[PDB]
Amino acid sequence: NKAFHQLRQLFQQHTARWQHELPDLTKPQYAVMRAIADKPGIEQVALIEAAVSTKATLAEMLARMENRGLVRREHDAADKRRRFVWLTAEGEKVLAAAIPIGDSVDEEFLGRLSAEEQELFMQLVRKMMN
Amino acid sequence: NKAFHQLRQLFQQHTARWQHELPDLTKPQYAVMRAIADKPGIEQVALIEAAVSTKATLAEMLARMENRGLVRREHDAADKRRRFVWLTAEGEKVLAAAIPIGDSVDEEFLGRLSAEEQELFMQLVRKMMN
């Protein structure tokens, strides 16, 4: 088989479990909220790398989060293209409730590996990346 | 870091290279065409697992491939819901031209691992799957 083919299978199974347990928060949405909480006021262009997204995908997703009162943003006075992102009080509640759920979904797959197998799996993924 | 987080990073980098080299054929589209060529006349419901897709995603994608003369389908006379999928002559040409391109994109990431690291990476992904 192809290694990237079975990776799609493992990823699809992970997405299927994640969607069932967290119907209103996908993994890219969850990663965006986690990165904002790790660095309140993070610049939106830096949030692209921190949450593994794109400029267009993040701008769309942040606009929906903003419209639902979960995300607050400010602008650079010298360049309104630059924006800084914060979690609202409701956003902190949504993220705090999702963290134990998301951790349990990861544990369903990672828990099948030993501690040495988990630490090494992280080494191989990092070795393949650019 | 989270193992499934870095997996998104590695997957996003792989998709970015794949989109640049194969602008008109994504990896799910490529996997569907590969599975049809491996089993000509495969039932559409079996193509879901063989290509790592869903019933709705595959039906949408096969309809577009059919409209572009790349995919040919027949129906069960006792149940028109069941369909069997073939590659057309143009579909075989599109897939044959994409295989060396897609293999080189995989090699960009897998080639950074030794043969033992590649064989073992496949073991860990299989161990995590349901």
Swiss-Prot record, chains A, B:
Residues 1-130 form the HTH marR-type domain. Induction: Expression is modulated by temperature, growth phase, salt and pH. InterPro entries: HTH_MarR-typ, Tscrpt_reg_MarR-type_CS, WH-like_DNA-bd_sf, WH_DNA-bd_sf. Residues 44-67 bind DNA. One of its GO terms (molecular function) is DNA binding. Keywords: DNA-binding, Transcription, Transcription regulation, Virulence. Transmembrane segments: none annotated. Involved in the temperature-dependent positive control of flagellum-driven swimming motility and cellular aggregation. Regulates fliC expression by directly interacting with fliC promoter. This is Transcriptional regulator HosA.
